[PDB]
Design a protein around this nucleic acid. Structure first.
Lengths: 198, 19, 107, 79, 94, 103, 103, 79, 108, 94, 19, 198
DNA sequence: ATCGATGTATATATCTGACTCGTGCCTGGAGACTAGGGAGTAATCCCCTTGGCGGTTAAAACGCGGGGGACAGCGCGTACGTGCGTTTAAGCGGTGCTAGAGCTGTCTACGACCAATTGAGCGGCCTCGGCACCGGGATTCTGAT
DNA sequence: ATCAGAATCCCGGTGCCGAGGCCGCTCAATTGGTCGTAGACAGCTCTAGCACCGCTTAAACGCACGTACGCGCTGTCCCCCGCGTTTTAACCGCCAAGGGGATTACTCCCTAGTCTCCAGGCACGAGTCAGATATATACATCGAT
């Protein structure tokens, strides 16, 4: 609740190369540049981790900024996880309507969104049973251009949630059916427009 | 008087039944 | 030539740093000791010795300005997170805690 | 003549009356000398080994702490 | 005419920073000397086998940090590591 | 008509008198003889000198171990719903320490 | 009529069947769950994986600690001349170990 | 569904039976779970401290044998 | 050049000597390790390993098998005071306990 | 994968010295692989402590002798001396 | 075959009472 | 009286220079010289002592030749003592009456004799009580010539036996008066020649 | 002491699957030869340990009396054991699959090391006052009123 | 409950030796710079740990029966505690003396160190027979009778 969120921030910033951290915090912007002025970059990365950990502990961080850090880490490093594309079959309240069918039977789950301007929603979803807290390390993601009838999904190792997530995307969108395309890879930007431009 | 550390100088705090 | 100063006062600690850095390699604990581990070790010894001496709470009840090892034993046996560190280590001219059971005392 | 009965019939009573003992049987005064002698054997059998190792013929107080540490009970105040 | 060094002066100096009006005998100096040359030996003899496990040939500050987080029981360690870290940051000022 | 105490109540004054003080309870002469005996049992006849501080070290650690043994055995005997002590209870408190008393 | 033994006479065949057996006596799934529960407490939320031989290691050390604890507490209960075990007996054998169980 | 009661009642029964216990009381099924829990809290803290030092993210069987050896029981037979 | 004669065969020792000398240099137990110490230490380990394995075999033939499982090692370490006192602080992986019923549990 | 040296062959050779007709399981090889490193680490730790008391900067074959008569309980340890002496003379005469 | 080293293979030799 | 003997021989051989070892051993003559021919002397003095100790063990000396080693080591090195001189006033029977009259108040006492041609008898006295075994390291020595009223005494740290020693020495001899001269020195031969001359 | 009911050690198949022995191959032993340097070994020296001795005296030895706890026997009631019918999840194989352990390169800060200060810490030294003993009254328990 | 009767303590007092400085002094930190190099960081791979998925069955859960052990109650009796006295070695000075740590100089052996090999130990692979079931039973054992 309190050590866990700074812990998640620390783990996620820990997997970032050393010369880009002041980049992504500049995209994060939770702590100001005045707090950022104590980062002793010329030591090893775990010292950077502890320094930004005590910094975000000072300003009383919470899960919204941590998940924002995660999704900017996806926005700048999408080539880590494996992406599979689904296809549907026949927007301002899409944000509010997608967080309805998720908490239908899987109650204690956290969801977040961020918006790209090409109607591409980046969706963060960290799965969890209604018995315990959801685990922020097994986090799955869905990017979706609302103009196209195609969607890219990196679902994590928590299986038996891909059908619930795709059916929630079906019922939340104005479509009727979904299909798992047989192609998938972990290099997203190459397959980003591979469904188009044929 | 420069040190005065923040702790709880409590008890032997017996194990073997509880706490 | 410049105006020298110790490592300890440059680190603001009372325990010496040249001494621990001499012992930490010429006691054969590694063939290499970093430049920071003696500072850290002097800090840990400083905190431990202050944690023992803050003894002086026990010395108020005896009203003696010296500290004699009966006070030290009544500190260390009667403070848990320093008891367990020195749980199987005794002390010269020790004495035990004043300790009677419950069944022993009459009505 | 006899060397083991120096630990005398009230001295063991003095030790028990230190350790929170209200009443002792009449057999402990003989039986606990066995434990005291076994412990003294398992200390001196290392103490003379240490001070025999350094080719000396005294038993320095460092080589009693350095045996009591090998037993499992370090004895402070004799550095 | 040969010197066997001590920690008596440092124990006496750190006594001033906790109880400015108290004294310590010679036997209390013996206790608080053999205590230090036990506990420093215990921490170093832990950190040595700890850095020997991971095949590193040094002992950095980090291995002493793992030694004091492992060896000291409980919440006392939770302050001592703090008392290390602030200390070593003072060694990166000057 | 003299004054005789309750049997038992001298022990509580003795316990509260002895748990305060830091004196030793075994005289230096008989303990010195029983410790100089053992060197002739281990070193094949040759006498070793005992430096007169190390005798105080054995004199200290022997009591600091034996009083732990006696106190823990008394705790065991108090567990047995009897207020005194016995050789069975010193036997039991010697056994439930494994090899830690012997190395 | 059915046939029942005297009680206890099952337990002796249970002992002589179990001391010969070198299996593990704690089932793998519940012990794996109870050892994964503590890593959430001790590592500030983030879970750690377990190399499945180290589960066998803790599954061995829990027995190596617990069967000696229970055997010594039963011995101390046998000192009190009663045939069954009790929490007083486990507390007493939990007591006379000094700090060596926790240090 | 409580994740500590996985060490179930006949398991503890047979575990006493291995040690040579005839009859066990009805309240041992809490106290033995308590001491099993405190033993695991005194081992796994050291094991994850070993691995968290080594910047690893799983705990090897070496990194719990080393925690046992420092704790007071070596366990042979794990490399 | 010269003959390829191992340092173990200059003692008749079935444990290596160059391994022990490398472990005593590189393991940091001193600055210099004298040449007699690995010669001594390989013999001490040879003696100790034979002392375990002989009683292991005596436990093995008394259960009519041929391969030694750890149960024979547990039953042959903790059955003699000259070795049980050495290994009081060691548990054995899947060793079991000695056949141990107490005094007054038996009927009659 | 690269190189993880062990004591697997040597215990096999000493078993075939003692017994012609006893096999030995892999778990038993694990037990006799941890036992050898444990005993060797204990004896060499005592050798280092004895080097550090008497101020000498080495571990000679004399300093092993005090450790081997120290650790092993009584009637066993003496035999180890009459192994090692009977070892070391056979080195020095050759 | 030259093993079966010359020791005294003996009892448990219980402590806690002497012996 | 079983293995203290070999340890006495070892600790007395240990108090010799390393270079005079073959000399004192060939003057001693308990072990055969063929047994001497298998002992290395480039070892430590501990190791040389230990090897000749095992040689004496396998040849099974009981008590006499060890005391010969004692008195011969003093016969080569007498200046490792402090020697007093007693002036007195008015050998087989001499040593016989001496043995019978020193077992007067103390019984378990070891006595030995070394005769020389200059009337010189060296008596080694290993002292002890009727309770204690006779100690071999608290020895006393008597150097006496049957033509002088002067005798030499190695005044041991087992004092308050030297009155009994000098009384049984006088009564064992043909004399009546005993007297201590005030001079003592740690060089035997100095007092020897200044009292043979004067 | 039976005999009925019940585990079990014994024994012939069988079907493994962990030995174990084969096999190149290297990377760690091993000769060969310095060198410097640490330890052996005489050699002296002062210190402190043992040895007595006298003489106090405060503990030991013993004893003796009486009483308060240990043990033994006995009721009684329950909380245990024990099977039994159930039911549930542990463990069985099997499939992904993937996070993440390991393994190479390749730097680059950084710690070993060598020298010259040079003062911080150490061995005597010496006051002096905090504390080790009386002591006399002034209290707190306590055993039988 | 009270009241003498003991322990104790505490306010005051005196003597004394061990702390707290003091002071010369000297050897070990420290500055300053050089240089290999240990490991930090980045990148790649493959492998074992996790999440399911079904299944199937052996153990876990509850329950009814019932008994025997733990506990309370006498009781009794005898072993140990508490003085009283009376012996006796522990202790405190005190002398001494010499055995032996503890130092110092000097001098070899010997072990770290660097090549130069080069082959014992090791990581893969195949053929296993030593166990692991599995009937079954022949025989031991429990317990009524």
């Amino acid at each position: 609740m309190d050590e866990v969120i700074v812990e998640y921030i620390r783990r996620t910033v820990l997997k970032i190369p050393r010369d880009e951290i002041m980049a992504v915090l500049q995209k994060w912007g939770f702590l100001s540049e005045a707090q950022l002025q104590t980062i002793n970059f010329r030591q090893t990365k775990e010292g950077i981790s502890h320094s930004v950990a005590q910094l975000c502990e000072e300003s009383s961080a919470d899960l919204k900024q941590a998940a924002l850090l995660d999704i900017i880490y996806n926005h700048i490093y999408p080539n880590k996880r494996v992406w599979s594309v689904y296809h549907m079959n026949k927007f301002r309240d899409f944000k509010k309507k997608f967080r309805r069918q998720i908490q239908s039977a899987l109650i204690n789950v956290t969801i977040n969104f961020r918006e790209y301007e090409d109607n591409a929603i980046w969706i963060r979803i960290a799965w969890g049973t209604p018995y315990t807290k959801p685990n922020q390390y097994k986090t799955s993601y869905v990017v979706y251009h609302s103009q196209t009838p195609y969607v890219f999904i990196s679902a994590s190792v928590l299986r038996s949630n891909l059908p619930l997530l795709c059916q929630a995307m079906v019922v939340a969108s104005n479509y009727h059916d979904i299909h798992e395309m047989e192609l998938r890879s972990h290099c997203l930007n190459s397959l980003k427009d591979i469904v188009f431009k044929r | 008087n420069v040190r005065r550390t923040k702790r709880i100088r409590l008890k032997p705090l017996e194990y073997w039944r509880g706490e | 030539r410049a105006k020298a100063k110790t490592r300890s006062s440059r680190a603001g600690l009372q325990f010496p740093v040249g001494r621990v850095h001499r012992l930490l390699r010429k006691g054969n604990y590694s063939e290499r000791v970093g430049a920071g581990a003696p500072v850290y070790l002097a800090a840990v010894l400083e905190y431990l010795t202050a944690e023992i001496l803050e003894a002086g709470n026990a010395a108020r009840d005896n009203k003696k300005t010296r500290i004699i090892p009966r006070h030290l034993q009544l500190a260390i046996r009667n403070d848990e997170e320093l008891n367990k560190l020195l749980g199987r280590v005794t002390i010269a001219q020790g004495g035990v805690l004043p300790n009677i059971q419950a069944v022993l005392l009459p009505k | 003549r006899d060397n083991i009965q120096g630990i005398t019939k009230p001295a063991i009573r003095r030790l028990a009356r230190r350790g929170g003992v209200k009443r002792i049987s009449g057999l402990i005064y003989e039986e606990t000398r066995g434990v005291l002698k076994v412990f003294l054997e398992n200390v001196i059998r290392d103490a003379v080994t240490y001070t025999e190792h350094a080719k000396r013929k005294t038993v320095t107080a460092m080589d009693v702490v350095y045996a009591l540490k090998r037993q499992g009970r370090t004895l402070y105040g004799f550095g | 005419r040969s010197r066997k060094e001590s920690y008596s002066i440092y124990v006496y100096k750190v006594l001033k920073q906790v109880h400015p009006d108290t004294g310590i005998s010679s036997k209390a100096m013996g206790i608080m000397n053999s205590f230090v040359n036990d506990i420093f030996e215990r921490i170093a003899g832990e950190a040595s086998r700890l850095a020997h496990y991971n095949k590193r040939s040094t002992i950095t500050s980090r291995e002493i940090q793992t030694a004091v987080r492992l060896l000291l029981p409980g919440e006392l360690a939770k302050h001592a590591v703090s008392e290390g870290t602030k200390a070593v940051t003072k060694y990166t000022s000057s | 008509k003299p004054h005789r105490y309750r049997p038992g109540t001298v022990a509580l004054r003795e316990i509260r008198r002895y748990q305060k003080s830091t004196e030793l309870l075994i005289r230096r002469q008989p303990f010195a003889r029983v410790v100089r005996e053992i060197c002739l049992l281990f070193t094949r006849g040759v006498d070793y000198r005992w430096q007169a501080m190390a005798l105080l070290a054995l004199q200290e650690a022997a009591e600091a171990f034996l009083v732990h043994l006696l106190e823990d055995a008394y705790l065991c005997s108090l567990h047995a719903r009897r207020v005194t002590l016995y050789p069975k209870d010193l036997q039991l408190a010697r056994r439930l320490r494994g090899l830690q008393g012997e190395g």
